[PDB]
């Protein structure tokens, strides 16, 4: 079982490992904090299955946030489609410093 | 990549330093083993121990004196927990 | 006593027991805490203006807000 | 795996036939490779082409028996225009236990295989006909 | 450039070990009543020339090996350690300004110890194997004790850089407050060299001879940037470069000059020595070194 | 998907197969065991590092001194085994019948 | 000498997995572990990388290796390659240069996954301000907000040196 | 004034670099010209592939791999 | 889904301000004196609401407040300005306790000519107010609402209805 | 040993597990883990055969690549969606890993290769706290980390579990391999219900936990390794073979018996859903691994094999083993039948 004298003897002396956003020693923030505290926010007073259900959205922009999955697709579809037109060779390309 | 430059030209030159060297002229015991890891735990200690430089400037000043004396305190009682019981011995 | 038998031993835990206790005897620690606490890392971040407050100095030549001068003076 | 079983279920039982042999043989090779590794890891055969004798007969009697059943399936339900009972697949059952039975060349436990493996697949088609869950609702 | 830098880095140092040979050679000399060598040209410059280019010609040791690599993979580690352990080091400019080197100095003293372990295994017979291993043992007791108080010794300067290290050296040695660290400190350095008096009683005797004197040059140029030398005026390095090389050729003269005089040590003395003496004593300086710069109001500016 | 996570989830395959196949030597398992663990810190440290995870930056250090201490007790089995038998193979294990 | 510095690097590292997981002699072994260690430091390094990695080179290549080939030392003997091993490395390495193939000249590589196939430039910070070096804040922490967590690592390690001994004769 | 140096070249970067996406991916279909993936209303910080993407090699391994081997 | 709104090229030119990095770095404290008290307006702007492409006019103002105030150190004393700051150059990472005595100079230049007293430590800290003329900006956090609440059970408890209600052991 | 050396070794086996009970953080479950091996290393090889030296070199292997997998399943949460909160897990691939890493922690059908070996060659105390620390530790964490569990996997585990802690135990007359298949088939049973209310793992852990501590207590009260032996201790006394007689009646789970308890409790709960011959395969299976127990029953206290004299000489010598608590838990594991609604006690 999982017992409760974390909350029990009013010492929290494990809940600031535990997520980011918790204050760090400088007050600095993390890569993704704001979608952190939307996402928290979104699914705090939460039964953990309206959780699944209902707060999808913003859960997949933090999970979008923190690995950058398909934002990288996208720039590597840019990439592929720069080469087999500089392969082409229709507008030697200006993209890059200078016209 | 400019420590790896530096760690290039000293590798192939102490690699010509060898190689022109060399083309031109032609049981056990346990006493051994209880101090590597004497020296392994106490290491591993001074690992716990060596960022305390990095942190002696924050707001929480004698928690780090009490947390850093708890643990130069524990590595004295292993030691002398070793040094009591005949853990280094002959 | 002792002091014959194993004195290098005596003598590590003297200073092991004075480095104990000196700190509780001691009128630096709160200026240690005060100089450690008074050097900033990040941006000191403004504030929107005032609900007429009689705080957060607008020049910061004023001396309202909290500053430091037992730095200079030692 | 679940695509291939599911393929094997997918077919209407029913006559869409020889792909329901097929499936059985892919299911009784894939047995047979499952049971065969366990084998193979555990007796350490020396010399490896003992090991690999050892392999191919498990794979080949588990497609074998998987093959004889999906016909007799198949020719049963042709036959007897019938494709609600269990009583065809119990015929399925004991012919996989009788040629289990001549392949490993006993027939004492090749009767005790036809009972037990016709009893099984009986309960297996009788078990897909009313509908009870793979394993779990999991729901209360 | 910086392959140049590279190269007026590691040419002089075969000029800086061979003339140490004949240094320490002489000065044993003279420690004792002995003039020479001094018949090979004036005062035996080309003695060390001499010997060197004589032992590169002659016969090497025949094999006699396992796993000829790993035979040669052994010296080839040593020197590269000898060679790639200069580049952090500041005489006034270092070549590369690090943010940490310490830790950078201890991690290939460690694998001085592997080049150590590696030419024992796969020498020889199981005699020299044994021999070899109370010598990485009688080397990795004691990178606990270096490491440790390198580490409160840089605690009073708090960062890692080394140029803050010759920046807070400024106003008065390190020597004074802290000296029995200090002291120990250097004890410790012989033993990382591996000299008298501490016992360790191969192929190529060279190489290996090679790896010692520059790691004992090594230690002591960190030695004389760690715990003595003087400021360092800008547009005008020859000063400091003056003062730093007359004080470490002063430190590496009394380091071979308290090689010159002693007995070596017996073996359990030397583990029980160093670990009921100075493991107590160090533990007892590093924690007034943690308690000490919380008490008189100076932790370091640490940027 | 920052593409050398991929190598070194594959590299983590490599060790853990290399710990459960091995063939003569126990001391070969455990420094496979230890280079699965080097795994992990790379692994959990180019992604703590690329994250900005700055305020429980403590998983490569602290996972690397306990698996450290793992190995340790690992080493002391080692040689236990080795002391009261010959040698430390796989084999001259086969006492003790399942 | 050009971008994808830590794609090659980490070919070098699981040719070196490969290269000692083939089973050799243990001291070849550990030979295999300490360049695996020091390209893996090289990667880390890569990343900056500024502590961890460097952190890293003392234990593993500094305290741990040198145990595991003292060992080796002084308890096998290993007295005399083969077919197993070699052949072993010879399918790692074909293994390796069929997945970096199809990297290579390919879109993505999947186990169960969608590996986006290119070198990591990306992601990387866009030049903030740092000025700490963000793994020496962070580490600088666990003597503030860490109290369990170096309580229970150092009882741990005792307890190791207890359990050392016991085995090894205790008292 | 770095801050809004800054802040005036990375949006310098962001302008120019979606008008030459704009110019360049004319021919699939779909694809909004300056869609963030992401769902909420807010200035996310890009991520160095938005800034220095399709710069071809060298000002990319200077700008982001500088400062972590420099030295 | 949604395009980003980029500004145009229309707001972004403003004179930038093409200086090097020693000068800027030595015409700091003083820039903090007379100058950058509008451009708390700006790191206001920026901490109130997390998106440039918004605050830009208050970087266009801190640009020309920047400009103005080294054109103004430009106009008068003093020229030796430009020793002190090739004074303090090429001394590796700039330490200002380098070239302090021309940093006296300097001070007494702009003291008895023009005035600017240096701010002195520590004065280039100390949480400072700023007000605007734009009213502060609400959830900037563009979310949705927070969807559902729990209902909070409670009420005071009546006892076991009938007992267990398994198969038996009623009461 | 010195006994303030065994109190610590036992004091930092409760803190180990308590720190898995306790925490919130999934590298202090994993040096939790870590800590009850370390900590359990030497209670086994007590005396020093080589017996229990392959034993313990066996167990610390297998359970370093156990710890080792946790911390691969760990990594590969926070490769996913990334925070050190014991929840929700974010990948069926990690959860994988995760269930199987903690089926080698516990006694598991693919994975029980060493229970046997490593209860063989050892003393009865180190196999006690062994199996009670041993299987307490896991149940904690599949109890916390259950909604994301494909359930094939525990569901796989259990039926194979069950099944082969009853097939392997039809052959061995080594007390010591009877009571591990036993705990075998045991775990089974109490990770089958995993996903449907904990509720009653937990009660069934409590239960067997009981049980096997009032049969390895029976056993230390003199000390047997074979079934003659348990003759002679018919001989030399009459009240352990009554205790035998009742204690392997309740680990053979008869209804008017406590170890029926949970048997019919999984049963119930079970079929609420739409599993049905799951649960009669499964209370099969369990009346299949009665059989060696009640093997066991006919060799000690019913029929009666013949003696060997020196019991003359043992019978001057009244009993003088210390229990530890006996008693206590034999009438608290066998007459605890009227006490079904104690299920709610739990939760």
């Given amino acids: 079982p999982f017992f409760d004298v974390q909350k029990k003897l009013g010492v929290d002396l494990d809940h600031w490992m535990t997520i980011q956003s918790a204050e760090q020693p400088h007050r600095i923030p993390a890569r993704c904090h704001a979608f952190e505290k939307e996402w928290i926010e979104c699914a705090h007073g939460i039964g953990s299955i309206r959780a699944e259900k209902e707060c999808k959205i913003e859960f997949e922009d933090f999970r979008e946030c923190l690995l950058r999955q398909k934002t990288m697709k996208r720039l590597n579809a840019i990439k592929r489609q720069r080469d087999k037109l500089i392969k082409e060779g229709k507008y030697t390309p200006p993209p890059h410093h200078s016209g | 990549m400019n420590l790896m430059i530096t760690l290039l030209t000293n590798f192939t030159l102490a690699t010509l330093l060898v190689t022109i060297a060399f083309w031109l002229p032609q049981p056990f015991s346990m006493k051994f083993f209880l101090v590597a890891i004497t020296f392994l735990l106490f290491d591993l200690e001074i690992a716990l121990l060596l960022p305390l430089p990095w942190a002696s400037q924050t707001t929480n000043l004698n928690t780090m004196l009490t947390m850093a004396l708890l643990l130069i305190f524990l590595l004295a009682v292993s030691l002398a927990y070793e040094w009591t019981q005949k853990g280094l011995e002959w | 006593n002792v002091w014959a038998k194993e004195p290098v031993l005596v003598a590590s835990f003297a200073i092991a027991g004075l480095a104990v206790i000196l700190p509780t005897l001691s009128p630096y620690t709160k200026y240690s805490l005060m100089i450690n606490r008074a050097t900033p890392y990040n941006y000191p971040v403004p504030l929107r203006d005032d609900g007429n407050m009689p705080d957060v100095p607008s020049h910061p030549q004023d001396p309202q807000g909290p500053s430091l001068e037992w730095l200079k003076r030692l | 795996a679940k695509t291939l079983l599911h393929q094997y279920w997918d077919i209407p039982e029913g006559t869409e036939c020889h792909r329901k042999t097929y499936a059985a043989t892919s299911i009784g090779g894939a047995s047979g490779l499952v049971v065969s590794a366990y084998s193979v890891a555990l007796k350490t055969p020396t010399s490896f082409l003992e090991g690999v004798a050892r392999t191919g007969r498990y794979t080949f009697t588990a497609a074998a028996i998987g093959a004889i059943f999906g016909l007799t399936s198949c020719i049963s339900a042709q036959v007897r225009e019938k494709p609600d009972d269990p009583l065809n697949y119990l015929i399925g059952g004991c012919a996989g236990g009788l040629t289990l039975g001549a392949r490993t060349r006993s027939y004492g436990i090749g009767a005790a295989a036809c009972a037990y493996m016709g009893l099984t697949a009986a309960l297996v088609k009788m078990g897909q006909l009313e509908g009870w869950k793979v394993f779990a609702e999991p729901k209360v | 450039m910086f392959m140049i830098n590279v190269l007026t880095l590691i040419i002089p140092i075969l000029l800086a070990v061979a003339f140490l040979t004949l240094v320490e050679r002489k000065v044993l000399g003279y420690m004792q009543f002995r003039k020479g060598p001094n018949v090979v040209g004036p005062y035996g410059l080309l003695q060390p020339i001499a010997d060197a280019i004589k032992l590169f010609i002659k016969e090497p040791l025949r094999p006699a090996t396992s796993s000829i690599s790993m035979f040669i993979l052994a010296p080839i580690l040593a020197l590269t350690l000898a060679l790639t352990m200069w580049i952090p080091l500041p005489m006034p400019y270092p070549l590369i300004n690090m943010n940490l080197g310490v830790l950078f100095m201890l991690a290939m003293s460690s694998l001085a110890v592997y080049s150590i372990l590696w030419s024992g295994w796969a020498s020889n017979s199981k005699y020299a194997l044994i021999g070899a291993l109370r010598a990485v043992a009688q080397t990795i007791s004691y990178e606990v004790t270096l490491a440790i108080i390198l580490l409160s010794v840089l605690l009073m300067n708090g960062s890692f850089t080394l140029s803050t290290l010759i920046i807070t050296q400024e106003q008065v040695w390190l020597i004074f407050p802290a000296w029995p660290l200090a002291m120990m400190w250097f004890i410790s350095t012989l033993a990382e060299t591996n000299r008298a008096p501490f016992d360790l009683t191969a192929g190529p005797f060279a190489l290996f001879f090679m790896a010692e004197y520059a790691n004992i040059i090594m230690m002591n140029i960190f030695t004389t940037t760690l715990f003595l030398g003087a400021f360092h005026n800008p547009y005008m390095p020859e000063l400091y470069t003056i003062n730093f090389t007359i004080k470490s050729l002063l430190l590496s003269i009394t380091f071979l000059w308290i090689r010159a005089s002693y007995p070596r040590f017996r073996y359990d003395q030397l583990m029980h020595l160093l670990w009921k003496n100075f493991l107590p004593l160090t533990l007892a300086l590093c924690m007034w070194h943690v308690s000490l710069p919380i008490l008189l109001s100076s932790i370091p500016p640490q940027t | 998907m920052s593409l050398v996570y991929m190598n070194i989830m594959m590299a983590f395959t490599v060790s853990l197969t290399g710990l459960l196949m091995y063939r003569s030597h126990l001391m070969s398992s455990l420094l496979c065991l230890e280079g699965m663990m080097l795994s992990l810190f790379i692994l959990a440290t180019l992604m703590i590092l690329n994250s900005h995870f700055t305020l429980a930056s403590m998983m490569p250090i602290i996972l690397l001194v306990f698996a450290a201490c793992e190995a340790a007790l690992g080493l002391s089995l080692l040689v236990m085994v080795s002391n009261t038998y010959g040698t430390d193979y796989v084999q001259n294990l086969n006492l003790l019948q399942c | 000498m050009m971008t994808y510095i830590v794609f090659i690097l980490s070919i070098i590292f699981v040719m070196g997995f490969v290269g000692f997981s083939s089973k050799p002699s243990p001291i070849y072994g550990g030979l295999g572990l300490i360049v695996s260690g020091g390209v893996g430091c090289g990667i880390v390094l890569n990343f900056g990388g500024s502590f961890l990695g460097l952190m890293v080179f003392l234990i593993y290549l500094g305290g741990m290796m040198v145990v595991f080939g003292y060992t080796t030392a002084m308890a096998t003997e290993q007295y005399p390659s083969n077919k197993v091993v070699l052949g072993t490395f010879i399918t790692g390495l074909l293994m390796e240069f069929l997945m970096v193939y199809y990297v290579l000249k390919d879109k993505e590589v999947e186990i169960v996954f969608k590996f986006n196939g290119m070198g990591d430039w990306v992601i990387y910070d866009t030049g903030d301000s740092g000025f700490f070096s963000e793994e020496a804040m962070g580490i600088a922490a666990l003597y503030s907000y860490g109290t369990w967590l170096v309580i229970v690592t150092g009882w741990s390690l005792l307890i190791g040196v207890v359990v050392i001994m016991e085995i090894t004769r205790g008292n | ?71 | 889904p949604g395009i980003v709104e980029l500004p145009s090229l229309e707001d972004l030119k403003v004179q930038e301000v093409k200086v090097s990095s020693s000068v800027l770095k030595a015409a700091a404290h003083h820039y903090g004196a007379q100058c950058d008290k509008p451009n708390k307006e700006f790191m206001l702007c920026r901490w109130e609401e997390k998106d440039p492409r918004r605050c830009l006019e208050e970087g266009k103002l801190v640009n020309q407040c920047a400009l103005e105030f080294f054109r103004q150190i430009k106009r008068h004393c003093a020229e030796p300005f430009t020793e002190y700051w090739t004074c303090i150059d090429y001394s590796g990472l700039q330490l200002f306790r380098r070239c302090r005595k021309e940093q006296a100079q300097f001070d007494k230049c702009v003291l008895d000519k023009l005035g600017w007293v240096r701010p002195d430590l520590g004065e280039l800290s100390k949480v400072t107010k700023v007000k605007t003329d734009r009213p502060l900006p609400e959830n900037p956090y563009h979310s949705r609402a927070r969807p559902e609440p729990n209902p909070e059970v409670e009420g005071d408890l009546k006892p076991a209805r009938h007992g267990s209600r398994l198969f038996f052991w009623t009461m | 040993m010195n006994p303030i050396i065994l109190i610590i070794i036992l004091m930092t086996v409760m803190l180990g597990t308590i720190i898995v009970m306790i925490s919130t953080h999934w590298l202090l479950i994993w040096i939790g883990f870590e800590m009850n091996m370390l900590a359990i290393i030497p209670i086994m090889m007590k005396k020093h055969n080589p017996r229990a030296t392959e034993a313990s070199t066996k167990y610390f292997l297998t359970q370093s690549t156990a710890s080792m997998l946790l911390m691969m399943a760990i990594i590969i949460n926070l490769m996913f969606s990334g925070q050190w909160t014991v929840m929700k897990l974010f990948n069926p691939m990690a959860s994988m890993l995760m269930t199987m890493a903690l089926a080698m922690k516990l006694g598991m059908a693919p994975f029980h290769f060493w229970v046997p070996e490593v209860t063989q060659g050892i003393p009865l105390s180190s196999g006690l706290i062994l199996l009670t620390w041993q299987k307490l530790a896991p149940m904690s964490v599949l109890y916390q980390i259950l909604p994301s569990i494909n359930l094939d996997l525990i569901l796989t585990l259990s039926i194979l579990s069950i099944t082969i802690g009853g097939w392997g135990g039809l052959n061995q007359t080594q007390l010591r391999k009877i009571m591990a298949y036993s705990s075998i088939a045991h775990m089974g049973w109490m990770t089958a219900v995993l996903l449907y209310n904990p509720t009653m793992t937990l009660l069934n852990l409590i239960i067997y936990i009981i049980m096997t501590s009032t049969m390895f207590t029976l056993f230390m009260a003199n000390s047997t390794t074979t079934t003659l032996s348990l003759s002679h201790t018919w001989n030399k006394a009459p009240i352990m073979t009554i205790l035998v007689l009742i204690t392997l009646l309740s680990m053979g789970g008869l209804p008017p018996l406590s170890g029926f308890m949970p048997k019919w409790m999984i049963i119930q709960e079970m079929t609420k859903n739409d599993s049905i011959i799951l649960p009669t395969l499964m209370a099969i299976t369990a009346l299949l691994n009665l059989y060696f127990y009640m093997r066991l029953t006919y060799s000690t206290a019913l029929t009666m094999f013949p003696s060997t004299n020196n019991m003359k000489m043992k019978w001057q010598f009244p009993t003088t083993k210390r229990m530890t608590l006996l008693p206590t838990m034999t009438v608290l594991s066998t007459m605890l039948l009227p006490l079904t609604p104690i299920l709610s006690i739990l939760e």
Wanted: no cysteine; proline share 3%; charged share 25%.
């Fill in chain 8, 1 to 71: 004034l770095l801050q809004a140096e800054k802040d005036r070249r990375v949006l310098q970067m962001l302008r120019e670099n979606l008008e030459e996406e704009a110019t360049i991916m004319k021919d699939v279909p779909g694809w909004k010209v300056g869609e963030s993936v992401f769902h909420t209303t807010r200035w996310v910080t890009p991520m160095m592939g938005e800034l220095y993407g399709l710069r071809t090699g060298e000002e990319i391994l200077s700008s982001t791999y500088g400062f972590i081997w420099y030295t």
